[PDB]
Structure 1
Amino acid sequence: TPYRQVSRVQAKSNPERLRRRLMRRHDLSEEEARKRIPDTVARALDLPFVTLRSQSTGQHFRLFIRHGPLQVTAEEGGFTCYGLSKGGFVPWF
């Protein structure tokens, strides 16, 4: 078996259909909310990931490659996050 295997576990951090109001609501007012951080600096466009769809979706919402967690260890009982644990066994042939 190689050190190859892909994963998808933890990608839920900052939604893109609902962005401007997740940033500061703690039951208080907004007097300075226009020049807080520059969001106009960064510009990226790539989505090579698996499109996995749900209800009320367009083409695909998002995902970014957050690779690096990999072991040669399969799933365990009681420890599930979405459908899979850290690592696993599948080889090439």
Structure 2
Amino acid sequence: MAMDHYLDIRLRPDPEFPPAQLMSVLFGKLHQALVAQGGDRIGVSFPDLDESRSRLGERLRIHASADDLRALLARPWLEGLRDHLQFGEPAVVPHPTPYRQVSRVQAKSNPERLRRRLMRRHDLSEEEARKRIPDTVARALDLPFVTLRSQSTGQHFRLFIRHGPLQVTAEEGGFTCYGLSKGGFVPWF
């Protein structure tokens, strides 16, 4: 926990979008700025969620610095949510701070994924494909997120994600492109 980039921000109310109706736009306007724009000294955390309540977004919680995340207060790439949101700037963090566990990982729940794999790897079709394939091992990761409707359909798909524990020690460096800890202790202030 060497960085001291805590930038808090709040929400804004709008009538033309639900939580997914701006969460899919957040997934569209954060990943490309973290990919085509990029920056390993910039990301996000998830320190204010819950399991049963399904709290996905409740406040500004980012991880930046004096130069890498210093363009998070003069950025016209996030312009348009002035009817539904806002942002802040980084503040001086203290010595003893926490570090929450998160992950922006991909969970898979295919019970017929063995059949779609064997269609190009085994030739075992759907007729005899119920002998030893995983019928219920492909579980679902139920959690609250936005409903990103890709070309498969217009319905709101669930945003699977795994939380983590809380350790007093920290780990500075780099995480995945989504900000979830792929080896690095994520921030939770």
TM-score normalised over the length of structure 2 = 0.25
Identical amino acids, percent of aligned pairs: 100
Number of aligned positions between the proteins: 93
Q: Distance in 1 between matches of 2:154 and 2:131?
A: 31
SS in structure 1 of the partner of residue 123 of structure 2? coil
Could you say which structure has the larger radius of gyration? 2
Between the aligned partners of 1:42 and 1:10, the Cα distance in structure 2 is 13
Q: 1:40 to 1:73 in 2, by over 3 A?
A: closer
What is the CA-CA distance between 1:20 and the residue it aligns to?
Answer: 8.2
Task: Say what the alpha-carbon RMSD is for the aligned residues.
Answer: 5.7
Going from structure 1 to structure 2, the CA distance change for 1:57 and 1:22 (only over 3 Å counts) comes to farther
Larger helix share, 1 or 2: 2
Residue of structure 1 equivalent to 2:103: 7
Partner of 1:44: 140
Q: Which runs of 5+ in 1 are unaligned?
A: none
Give the TM-score taking structure 1 as reference length.
Answer: 0.36
Give CA-to-partner distance per residue, 1:23-54, whole Å, 9 cap, x none: 99721455545798997999999652233443
**Range that drifts further, 44-53 or 32-41:** 32-41
- For residues 74 and 64 of structure 1, do their structure 2 counterparts lie closer, same or farther at Cα, with a shift above 3 Å needed? same
Offset of 1:8 from its aligned partner? 1.4
Q: Give the Å deviation of 1:19.
A: 8.4
More strand by share: 2
> Which structure ranks higher in relative contact order (CA pairs < 8 Å, sequence separation ≥ 6)?
1
